[PDB]
């Protein structure tokens, strides 16, 4: 019906590369999704909103250089709780880059 | 890239219901997807393979008319172990019909 | 904005009785409820789509006269788990009446 | 019976957005919600007391610009526990704003 | 204000004696509670209803002519759960008599 | 037989009420409950003796005008420890106002 | 003050022997305790009433000629649950006999 | 045979008020028990010796004129455990008066 | 001081076997141990006494000609619950044989 | 066969005292225990060694003129971590005086 | 340095399927694998023994024609306890078939 | 098939020990591992990638001259946590060496 | 110092097979172990007395053909419960074969 | 078969004494035990290399004159985490002395 076309890449060793993009529907997404990612990542599939404001959810990040998936929350002082990685941490919000918040997942592994 | 499409169906209260059809990329299936189903069902999209043999795995079944993605486990004997609802039970794999396999969920709620 | 009557009741005791009407707006029911019911019950209001088709939820139900807010789930053999009372217990769906399916709950008390 | 009209906001991303005034019955409230707000956020409405002033409960907050929904405990010092995200913290009842303590809530999500 | 008076009952080693009549307040008791009985049982007053229907709840009973407060549940196949002693049990409900349902309690120790 | 009449109140959002007399017992006491107050609060109702000398146990109390119901414990050091509310805290005895011990407790919510 | 003399005894082995008389105080006993017995067991002394009729609580008895205090609690059925022992048991009230409840117990050792 | 007497008094809202003497017999105690308390608190008997030399175990004591009875524990620098209360805590041997330690304790309430 | 000797034997693999007499003191044993066995099994010494009449204990037992020390219960209906082994079992008390009560236990090891 | 006598006393209160003489086999001792105590307390004799070392271990201790028999642990810095009573607690090896290590002990109370 | 062909196939659905020979060194295995296969299921490699006798283990199976790798466990009366599925179950070792066992895996997702 | 070979070593006691060859096939590896070492280590064989960048992930590293495996988490602030060994600890990454990252174990014991 | 020559075998895929002859000293065993079995097993060295009588314990036995190191424990009836595997099981004592108990073990890996 | 000789020793209260040699064979270890010794410690033999280098494992060790065996663990900055006796602790490595690792142990008591 609707094909919806988002600029895809892969997430391997902590380091983004871009790829083929990937077709998708519109109706993927309730809210539009306008400035998209497809990143391909441990037989997952993440559609990231480029746009997206701070706010607690799951995020697409650059931490030092190291890219990767984390759930953010945010603390009291503009701090960060960060998860998703084998030990979670704190820091604060400007010692962390945020290129956008994962929208929706797709996977084929249960 | 490769625009793909599925039949659409919506699952609600047990009933499956034909629906707009979906936009996928062929890239979101390692073994190719021929005759599919896209049911939308509670906020996820469940990717269906209706030519899938019986084995362990999520699927989605007809229980006497009732439509719903449980978790079987054959057991001795020609039975099933059906999981996903609130209290799992067991029965015949002929109390249960099979109306494929799913190959892959996508999900926009965490 | 858009107000909406529905027929009141109490549960106490096991029995139901009528009571006030209630007014509520359309827009707490994402699936139009036009037969519905509203059980104050324990700091609770209930609302019943008493059109319902039987499906696993939570159910206002009849057995053998007693009224009660259950949560139901089929089992193979035209068989129940029910579950909300004091003690689960299994039976035929021909051992209970179901008045119609709770499809939401105000509360006050948390 | 008694139609009642609340002002209606969604809660989405942590933003509050203005919407659809709200249709209720003052059977709702104990005590009278005279300034109130009705919120839609995440397949609930949530019945928010504008004028409550600060005690242990369930508020509706802002912090550093995020709005959200939270459980506030009152800590020596003018101190506060908050609780409904991932992760609790504390900090101080002045790095916070109140907006209204929630006095109901509807679900028609189990 | 609105004086109510109740027959007086003492419950000790199993064994109801009568006793002095109590005076309460009608406004106790939701519900009209017409034929009542008020039992002092270790440092708490139960308020019984002798007129209640069979429904789950907390109960006075007699058992085999030994009198006490069980919380009774209905089991399928006219059955009982009784709890309240040092080791719950079922039986049918021929096997125990009614005597009343508790309807309220009042209590001095913590 | 012995009717009481104690004062009414109810407690709500932190803020104590006066409200209707109720009529009691003295049979409900075994102390002499002389100057003493039914408090109404959350489908319960407390009776409060305010002659008591500070001694460990549930009290209604007073800290910086919110009144509620805590269970205190004197710690040496003119300090008390503070339970009840959704997280227990210390401070000093004068940081607190007592105005009265609960000495019973009426309910019919189990 | 009052002065009061009872039967004396020992309890060892699960062999009763008698011995000394016991001089207490009547203001041991709420109810009076009229025949009564003292048994000194492994420490402690308990307070039996050789004149109680069968209730749940605490016994002494004699079991297929073995003396043993014991916890019992009657079950449908002139059944009766025996706790106390290192395993507990059930058994009909006919295959024990009691010598009398405990009504009160006095040690020496915490 | 050997009767005894001790000083009576009873325990309530920490306050020890004098009362009947007790009547005893010596073999009660292994120890003689010469200057001696029978405290009724709590539908329990508490025989104290005033004459105890501090030493870990159960004590009548005075914290900042409360009167309570309370399991003491020696620590390090002069120190104390002190349990028994809702809460336990620490503080110094001076911070406490003891008054006598817990020889035996009799009971009617199992 | 006051010396006593007792027959001497060490129990390993299941076999009893004779060996040095031991010495030890009275006052090791509050009743007399007349006829008595000092039982050597894995670096601990078991006193046990041959007289003995069965009661719930710690026995010395011959099962079917194995030899080991266990714990004795007795169950209605000449039964025996027998503990002390990797797993415990019943059986009755004639498939059993008592060689005595174990009435001390001295280890070196903790 | 062998006998030896030790010298006896008794732990209470935390006090030692002198006492009858106790006559044991050497075979209770696989070090030979020469200068040693027998030490009756709780229902258990404790055989300690004055001569051992500082070691881990099970201990005759004297602390601020009390005597126990506690489990002390070495910790780095000259330290101990003493067990045995209510609440342990660490302190300098210099702040108790050992009187002897526990070899053995014997009890007749499982 | 040792060059050793396997041949290869893949576990799919429980469908087993030749597919390319793998390059293994003989330093792989301690006991030599003469006749072996090399599947690959779900990231991972299993290294089977096609001539293995039956024997507690991990083995590749096939059970009414699905084909698995399960743990086997045998059980009195030629039976198996069969792991490694969802849900573990029993079975007469003639209802399974054995192709071989599991001697070593290789894997690269942890 | 694709015959490939790998230098080898031994890791034991922390020391990193050059082996015999090993000859494995490429289909071991997704990515190519180009500079691969195979580290027998406890019954098992690492296969690491000399050349991969710093990454959450399993490594073979040198701390202070010791050689082992260790799960290594990034942490804010050039940081990293270190598992693995009996007690986890965080350190800078530049107070360890990473020899390379094991992308495939092998293991022979389950 | 005292060397001792003990027969060798190793236990592998439930097969016994001979092997080179062990040398230990007499001090490894308290009882003179005169014709036993050392066998390797698993990184292990079993040392088995093919003497022994049955007695619950570990034992090298043959079930069937497969021989394997087991914990019996004898039951009532001649029966035997059998650990050690992944799941025990009871049998008759007639329906395994025991090789030896396991008097020792030596182990390199903890 | 291949007779070794290891010099013996024996611990007790933390003191380590020479002993007769311990006969053992070379096939007790894989790695090769030149200058090693056998220590006699609470019924188990533990064989040590005194030649091995810092590593985590199991060590005899010397801490301020004791002796013992302890679980070492490397922790950055030198220190140690030290577990196996009654309370773990941390120290610096030279803060204690090494006097080889632990290669095997041998034990008859399960």
Redesign the interface.
Known sequence: ?????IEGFTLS???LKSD??????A????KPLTDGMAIRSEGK?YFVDKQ??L????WLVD??G?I?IR?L??????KL?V?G???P?E?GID??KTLGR???????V?
Not at 1 to 5: E, G, H, N, T, Y
Not at 73 to 78: A, D, H, V
Not at 102 to 108: A, D, K, L, N, P
């Open positions: 019906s609707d094909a919806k076309r060793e902590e380091i083929k993009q990937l077709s998708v529907d109706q993927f997404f309730t599939i997206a404001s706010s607690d959810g799951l931490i030092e190291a990767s759930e929350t945010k603390l009291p002082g503009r709780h998860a990685g084998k030990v941490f820091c010692d962390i994962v929208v929706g997942v797709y996977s084929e249960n």
